Design a protein around this nucleic acid. Structure first.
Length: 420
RNA sequence: UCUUUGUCACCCUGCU
RNA sequence: AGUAGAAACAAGGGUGUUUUUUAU
């Protein structure tokens, strides 16, 4: 029964909304500005960083004059004279937490917060790039397809594997191995056992992510590498190279920022009385009645930033180009075409001329086509840069492959088709 | 019983 | 595992530096 899970989603949303209207009562943020997105985004960032046992270690060490480690904050954004200002403020950890508990009947409800971190992470990946990290690893950048959701902490929602990507697993494993061959003490001790268990756990997560026989066999052979070595890296490399085709739909939860919260409850939709279906028509049934705004820099066409943030929230970073095209009815791409800059604002950047905009947040729109498309010969030439498996690997790899673009998963339907 | 970490590079030693 | 045999090896010791800002 979904409905008890829905009772869960309801209790967490109402706890969080209690805290939200409390915070506002401490914020008196205007209703108009109640939709300028960057404000509530950094507002989110606040409570995100607010939770860190490691930061607790930070304060314990007191290595630097970190801003009252027991208290945290960042730049906030109010206006004057129709123009806007920057304000560095900071709340106190225990105080926010105490709100949080009497916002959560004394509990925490980490669920919605982790959801918000999913939000921030998908935003980053959709809006930014980290090829320089691959430079730190040394493999093809265009491998990027499987970096969906890269920026998530090692202690964040572990079931987030729903979004944690293959390439993430690859690169983190390579890290562990690299650092592993950097020390013998790395394995001696209970630290060794616990890290080994977690390592194998990551391997098992990868198994779950794999769905084909030869892949299972190669990944298993990998798992047997009980000692950190070097060849395993290249095995994983070519396995990923073959899997570039061999992709299955991942969990893509159309997580939208919470800034809606005020207007969300003003619209009357508690996650309780109706639960929710985050995948399906429910997301598109809530991305039209809402309303959200954003601070604007001139001489950057506000329409570019519009499309960028819209699809960023849409989390379609690796969706079919032409699918997204018929999805919004006006051409889209990776950012290279998305001629704009970041949605937020940097410190030294001079806000002294910025502007405001009631931004557009809509689109055009069963499974008419399979969107199937083979690859290009460069894809197979990728292999020539290099067990029994490679025979089978090569075999299917040369005839014909079923899907060109990375992924095309969404419960989308027609807007006027709210039932289907 | 499903709980690595806020990130990596350089020296030296050869019986004292 | 193996060398070896009344106790050992299967290497041993030091040096670095993180809160933001983003696309080739």
């Amino acid at each position: 029964n979904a409905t008890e899970i829905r009772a869960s989603v309801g209790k967490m949303i109402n706890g969080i909304g209690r805290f939200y209207i409390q915070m506002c009562t401490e914020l008196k943020l205007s209703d108009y500005e109640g939709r300028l997105i960057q404000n509530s985004l950094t507002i989110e960032r606040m409570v995100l960083s607010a939770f860190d046992e490691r930061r607790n270690r930070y304060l314990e060490e007191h290595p630097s004059a970190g801003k009252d480690p027991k208290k945290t904050g960042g730049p906030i954004y109010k206006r004057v004279d129709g123009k806007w200002m920057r304000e560095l403020v900071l709340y106190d950890k225990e105080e926010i937490r105490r709100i949080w508990r009497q916002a959560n009947n004394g509990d925490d409800a980490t669920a919605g917060l982790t959801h918000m971190m999913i939000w921030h992470s998908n935003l980053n990946d959709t809006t930014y790039q980290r090829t320089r990290a691959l430079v730190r690893t040394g493999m093809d950048p265009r491998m990027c397809s499987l970096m969906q959701g890269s920026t998530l902490p090692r202690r964040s929602g572990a079931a987030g594997a729903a979004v944690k990507g293959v390439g993430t697993m690859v690169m983190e494993l390579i890290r562990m191995i690299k650092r592993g061959i950097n020390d013998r003490n790395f394995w001696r001790g209970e630290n060794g056992r616990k890290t080994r268990s977690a390592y194998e756990r990551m391997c098992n997560i990868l198994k779950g992510k794999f769905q084909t026989a030869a892949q299972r066999a190669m990944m298993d052979q990998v798992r047997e590498s009980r000692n950190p070595g070097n060849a395993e890296i290249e095995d994983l490399i070519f396995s990923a190279r073959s899997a570039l085709i061999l992709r299955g739909s991942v969990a893509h939860k159309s997580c939208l920022p919470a800034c809606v919260y005020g207007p969300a409850v003003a619209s009357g939709y508690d996650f309780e009385k109706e639960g929710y279906s985050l995948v399906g028509i429910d997301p598109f049934k809530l991305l039209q009645n809402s309303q959200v705004y954003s601070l604007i820099r001139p001489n950057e066409n506000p329409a570019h930033k519009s499309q960028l943030v819209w699809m960023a929230c849409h989390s379609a970073a690796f969706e079919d180009l032409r699918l997204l095209s018929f999805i919004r009815g006006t051409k889209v791409s990776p950012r290279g075409k998305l001629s704009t800059r970041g949605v937020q604002i940097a410190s030294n950047e001079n806000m002294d001329t910025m502007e405001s905009s009631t931004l557009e947040l809509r689109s055009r729109y069963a499974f008419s086509v399979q969107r199937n498309l083979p690859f290009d010969k460069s894809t197979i030439m990728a292999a020539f840069t290099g067990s029994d498996m490679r025979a089978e690997i090569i075999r299917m790899m040369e005839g014909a492959k079923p899907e060109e673009v990375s992924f095309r998963g969404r419960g989308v339907f027609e807007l006027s088709d709210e039932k289907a």
